[PDB]
Design a protein around this ligand. Structure first.
Ligand SMILES: Nc1nc2c(ncn2[C@@H]2O[C@H](COP(=O)(O)OP(=O)(O)CP(=O)(O)O)[C@@H](O)[C@H]2O)c(=O)[nH]1
Ligand SMILES: Nc1nc2c(ncn2[C@@H]2O[C@H](COP(=O)(O)OP(=O)(O)CP(=O)(O)O)[C@@H](O)[C@H]2O)c(=O)[nH]1
Lengths: 307, 307
């Protein structure tokens, strides 16, 4: 049975590091690591460094492709001070670590030669504001496809990849649980743009952001493990984020372990699980590379699309 | 407003012919032309020849891309006596001419230098047999996504593109309105494979045939024009295909003009229109190139995906 995919284990995958330099300290790793995430410098050596290699190889080859269409159109030859930006999508469930994965990947690629401008944008900024979610009856569907201004997101990525000088994305506060009035993230003709979100890999009756990806990543794990990571991280946040009297979720700080397990389980069951099953997981088959995590957060298997 | 697309008119498009040779007679054109289709050598010069150019340019550049992943995997370098087959998808409504478009495109590419093996497979062969359609209650949904063994189709294209020596597709009889017992089409490591069908561009919760396309075409026209072409061609077939006493639809030969208009309109309304609206048209936004036809069958506008 021939297949579009090839599976790896860490053994096999790490061999494809060749001689890529590790350009990242313990202190820097820390700054990118989210609460509960186990990633260390080893994993970055054996997992993220082959990945960065693969991407370097594909960036050049992906340029050929746009140049051919340029040659065809008889267009001015492509300004080397600004090629067509490489778009990378990073998807997966709440609590699976995908955000850390994208930050880390950003760090690795910013540290190539001649030092490529590598931007990272999360789809948080494209959530509808709370007022607008209330209007659409979606205050309990935050993270579902329809809780996003998908049109604005598509405008953004399309703006960037088409070679615009600058594009703006709004900005989300996790503290306040809402979009920040007046705040903008500004992205200026990067060489690489990484876009990270739950549903970035979605497809539809219209051209979407996944149709612009030159490369995509989906961070995966058994569903019960993710529930565990999610519940655990919720308990943990009682003394970090919820501890802030400003936090929209301050009332959670005073929960008992079991009150907090109960609350976390109910949010998992009513929001995050259904989203993962109905929307996120169906996008996995299209990802260039799946990073499979064992119950301890450790990436031990990988699935690559060779077709 | 930046855009993934660039629109052309025939004027603009035909200029991109450069100096591509026309390698096709009137007699050969005829043999590829379906009943009711207006395509002539002019249209092939001004429309199909830029298209063949664009494709030649992209075939080489698409090879870079697979070689990079090969370089990454540290794989044996790619046998030049057999590169990774270029897959082209051709979609659109019943009666819009897409089949002619694909035959013609096959002819043009088979007539390049060193003479590339260019296969053409229609998704007809992958219809479930009638007995099996009856079982699924789908004898009046022929052409809808679910009337196809999509799994077998995916196995086929995956087989070919992965570099298999041979792959087999079943074969459909239009005469008998059913799959032909024992019949196989055999495709042997072509350089280019064209896959033509109503829904080939569909997407889904699984990796599908559209995810293997390196290039896609969608032949388009105003919906009322296609109904007209369909109705007209149905009347016409009273003295061609239906005229055969063997034809599954022989009883249609004896219809009056207006009886035949009535029958054709009802099939349009109950089958072909709903399929076009619900399934085929939503795939248009993803096509590399849309070929837009005026009420006379003439391709006068084109939409290209530059992103
Ligand atoms: N204030 C607050 N922040 C949260 C909450 N849940 C998640 N976050 C933060 O918002 C972002 C969303 O995390 P999540 O959606 O689970 O994805 P993830 O990829 O697992 C996040 P990472 O890899 O950094 O741990 C993360 O940066 C996380 O630290 C919450 O309930 N309250
Ligand atoms: N025997 C028979 N053949 C049909 C009938 N309708 C279409 N065909 C033939 O089967 C194929 C399906 O045509 P259709 O699905 O309309 O697509 P198309 O791209 O417009 C076909 P072309 O470009 O060759 O005219 C074509 O080769 C056509 O000649 C029919 O009712 N009976």
């Amino acid at each position: 049975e021939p297949s579009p995919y090839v599976e790896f284990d860490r053994r096999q995958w790490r061999a494809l590091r060749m001689s890529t330099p590790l350009a990242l300290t313990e202190e820097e790793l820390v700054g990118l690591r989210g609460l509960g995430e186990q990633i260390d410098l080893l994993e970055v050596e054996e997992v993220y460094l082959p990945l960065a290699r693969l991407i370097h190889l594909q960036v050049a080859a992906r340029q050929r492709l746009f140049a051919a269409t340029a040659e065809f159109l008889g267009e001015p030859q492509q300004n080397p001070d600004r090629p067509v930006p490489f778009i990378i999508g990073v998807a997966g469930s709440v609590a699976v670590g995908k955000s850390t994965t994208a930050r880390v990947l950003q760090a690795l690629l910013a540290r190539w030669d001649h030092h490529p401008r590598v931007d990272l944008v999360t789809t948080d900024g494209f959530l509808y504001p709370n007022a607008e979610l209330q209007r659409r009856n979606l205050m309990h569907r935050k993270g579902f496809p329809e809780s996003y201004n998908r049109r604005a997101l598509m405008r953004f990525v399309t703006s960037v990849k088409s070679g615009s000088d600058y594009a703006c994305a709004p900005v989300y506060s996790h503290l306040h649980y809402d979009i920040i009035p007046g705040a903008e993230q500004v992205v200026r003709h990067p060489d690489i743009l990484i876009l990270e979100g739950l549903n970035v890999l979605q497809t539809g009756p219209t051209l979407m952001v996944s149709d612009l990806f030159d490369f995509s990543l989906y961070v995966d794990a058994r569903i019960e493990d993710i529930e565990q990571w999610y519940v655990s991280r919720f308990l943990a946040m009682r003394t970090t984020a919820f501890a802030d009297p400003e936090s929209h979720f301050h009332h959670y700080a005073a929960f008992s372990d079991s009150q907090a397990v109960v609350a976390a389980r109910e949010i998992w069951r009513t929001i995050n699980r259904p989203n993962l099953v109905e929307n996120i997981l169906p996008t996995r088959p299209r990802a260039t590379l799946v990073l499979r995590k064992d119950a301890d957060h450790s990436i031990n298997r990988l699935r690559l699309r060779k077709l």
